[PDB]
């Protein structure tokens, strides 16, 4: 796990197409080790495991 906080910029693999997209963290559920990200400029959100988030440099 890396240290993440709500509002952090990150990138993540979108489950719809298996591609990396820029995202912002909208919420974190520390007990389940998940978060919700919003894909920046793509209008969509998704639950992600915190362990699966990537550097915001990956695009």
Swiss-Prot record:
Reported effect, residue 48 to E: In SMA1; impairs binding to substrate containing dimethylated arginine; abolishes the interaction with ELAVL4
Top-rank lineage group of the source organism: Eukaryota
Record annotation: effect of changing residue 39 to L/F: Impairs binding to substrate containing dimethylated arginine
Stated consequence of mutating residue 14 to L/V: Impairs binding to substrate containing dimethylated arginine
Consequence of changing residue 28 to F: In SMA1; abolishes the interaction with ELAVL4
Subcellular location: Nucleus, Gem; Nucleus, Cajal body; Cytoplasm; Cytoplasmic granule
Stretches assigned to the Tudor domain: 3-59
Resulting phenotype, residue 21 to H: Impairs binding to substrate containing dimethylated arginine
Tissue specificity field: Expressed in a wide variety of tissues. Expressed at high levels in brain, kidney and liver, moderate levels in skeletal and cardiac muscle, and low levels in fibroblasts and lymphocytes. Also seen at high levels in spinal cord. Present in osteoclasts and mononuclear cells (at protein level).
Effect seen on changing residue 46 to K: Impairs SMN binding to RPP20/POP7. Abolishes the interaction with ELAVL4. Abolishes interaction with SNRPD1 and SNRPD3. Impairs binding to substrate containing dimethylated arginine
Consequence the record notes for mutating residue 42 to D: Impairs binding to substrate containing dimethylated arginine
Subunit: Homooligomer; may form higher order homooligomers in the dimer to octamer range. Part of the core SMN complex that contains SMN1, GEMIN2/SIP1, DDX20/GEMIN3, GEMIN4, GEMIN5, GEMIN6, GEMIN7, GEMIN8 and STRAP/UNRIP. Part of the SMN-Sm complex that contains SMN1, GEMIN2/SIP1, DDX20/GEMIN3, GEMIN4, GEMIN5, GEMIN6, GEMIN7, GEMIN8, STRAP/UNRIP and the Sm proteins SNRPB, SNRPD1, SNRPD2, SNRPD3, SNRPE, SNRPF and SNRPG. Component of an import snRNP complex composed of KPNB1, RNUT1, SMN1 and ZNF259.
Clinical disorder: Spinal muscular atrophy 1: A form of spinal muscular atrophy, a group of neuromuscular disorder characterized by degeneration of the anterior horn cells of the spinal cord, leading to symmetrical muscle weakness and atrophy. Autosomal recessive forms are classified according to the age of onset, the maximum muscular activity achieved, and survivorship. The severity of the disease is mainly determined by the copy number of SMN2, a copy gene which predominantly produces exon 7-skipped transcripts and only low amount of full-length transcripts that encode for a protein identical to SMN1.
Function noted in UniProt: The SMN complex catalyzes the assembly of small nuclear ribonucleoproteins (snRNPs), the building blocks of the spliceosome, and thereby plays an important role in the splicing of cellular pre-mRNAs. Most spliceosomal snRNPs contain a common set of Sm proteins SNRPB, SNRPD1, SNRPD2, SNRPD3, SNRPE, SNRPF and SNRPG that assemble in a heptameric protein ring on the Sm site of the small nuclear RNA to form the core snRNP (Sm core).
Domain notes: The Tudor domain mediates association with dimethylarginines, which are common in snRNP proteins.
Further comment found in the protein's record: The SMN gene is present in two highly homologous and functional copies (TelSMN/SMN1 and CenSMN/SMN2). The telomeric copy of SMN gene (TelSMN/SMN1) seems to be the SMA-determining gene while the centromeric copy seems unaffected.
Family: Belongs to the SMN family.
Protein name: Survival motor neuron protein
Shown segment, full-protein numbering: 89 to 147 of 294
């Amino acid at each position: 796990l890396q240290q993440w906080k709500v509002g952090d910029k990150c990138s993540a693999i979108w489950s719809e197409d298996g591609c990396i997209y820029p995202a912002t963290i909208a919420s974190i559920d520390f007990k389940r080790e998940t978060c919700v990200v919003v894909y920046t400029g793509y209008g969509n959100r998704e639950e992600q495991n915190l362990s699966d988030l990537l550097s915001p440099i990956c695009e």
